[PDB]
Amino acid sequence: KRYEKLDFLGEGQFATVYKARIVAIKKKDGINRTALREIKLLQELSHPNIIGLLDAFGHKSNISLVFDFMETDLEVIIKDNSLVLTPSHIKAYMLMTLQGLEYLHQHWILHRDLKPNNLLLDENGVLKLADFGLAKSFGSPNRAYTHQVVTRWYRAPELLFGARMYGVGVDMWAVGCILAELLLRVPFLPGDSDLDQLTRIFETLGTPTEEQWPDMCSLPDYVTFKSFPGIPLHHIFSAAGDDLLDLIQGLFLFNPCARITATQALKMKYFSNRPGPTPGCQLPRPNC
């Protein structure tokens, strides 16, 4: 084709990615539904914090998708022990993620796979949401959604309780987890199963009552848990200011309706307080 293979980038659970010329190429049922989902969603979206689809090619039932080459991802940054994440860097990453999410949710699309490795960073420090193979439209009552979406460590409690219909909270909760992973440098709630994921969430944040989650017991896979008191947020995040703790609490509200939206998060004092977000050029780079 018109792209020459230069390097092998890596693999996922649906395709293999390679660096070519810079761009990145991702390679009886016909064309794969995940590739079609990515194509159909990314062709309708244009925002600086959403990965840009440049082309697509294939033969018979096989297809390859072309994207801008993204230098790294947030998971690499988090795991790099030589990298220091100042409050300004965290604010910048969070701001870009939330701006991309605000644009995405305005166009009635849920990412449903938010996690640090799906937040790609270029050489200019522009974060971009990527891996739209699980993303879907929302706001349509007739469309039924599965609860398997989102990786378990970032899955919202309503999903773990079997919610078929859900809104932007499933992204915002993941955002909160990402924020926690930015603050602790380790996954916040690393459950090994759905029950253990719910147990970790309730042990860290407390078992939600009816007041905190008015219709909790109506979820199809709801199971009553031992009443945990939780750990106060300032204990978990000892270096977090009051504004950041307010943002975290808003992102981790058990009630998905009460959980702050991307727009509401962007308006919080934390983003407008000093210090300002780091300029993208000054964000840290994981040199080898």
């Binding site: 349509s140 919610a163 932007v168 000093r274």
Partner: protein, 65 residues
């Protein structure tokens, strides 16, 4: 070097859509199916469907190729 929120300014080429939290107070929600307790538990409200329907009804109504 601070950040200030600025709302997304996307031209819709159509009539203005009432705000989401306004819908209930403006009477729109009387004309959509009520969300079930399970729907609300998951975070799905009838306001979302009403808002999306209004946005699609008004999108591009004034646009000419």
């Amino acid at each position: 070097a601070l950040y200030e929120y600025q709302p997304l300014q996307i031209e819709t080429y159509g009539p203005h859509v009432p705000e989401l939290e306004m819908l209930g107070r403006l009477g729109y929600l009387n004309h959509v199916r009520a969300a079930s307790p399970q729907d609300l538990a998951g975070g799905y409200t009838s306001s979302l469907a009403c808002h999306r329907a209004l946005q699609d009804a008004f999108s591009g109504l004034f646009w000419q190729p």
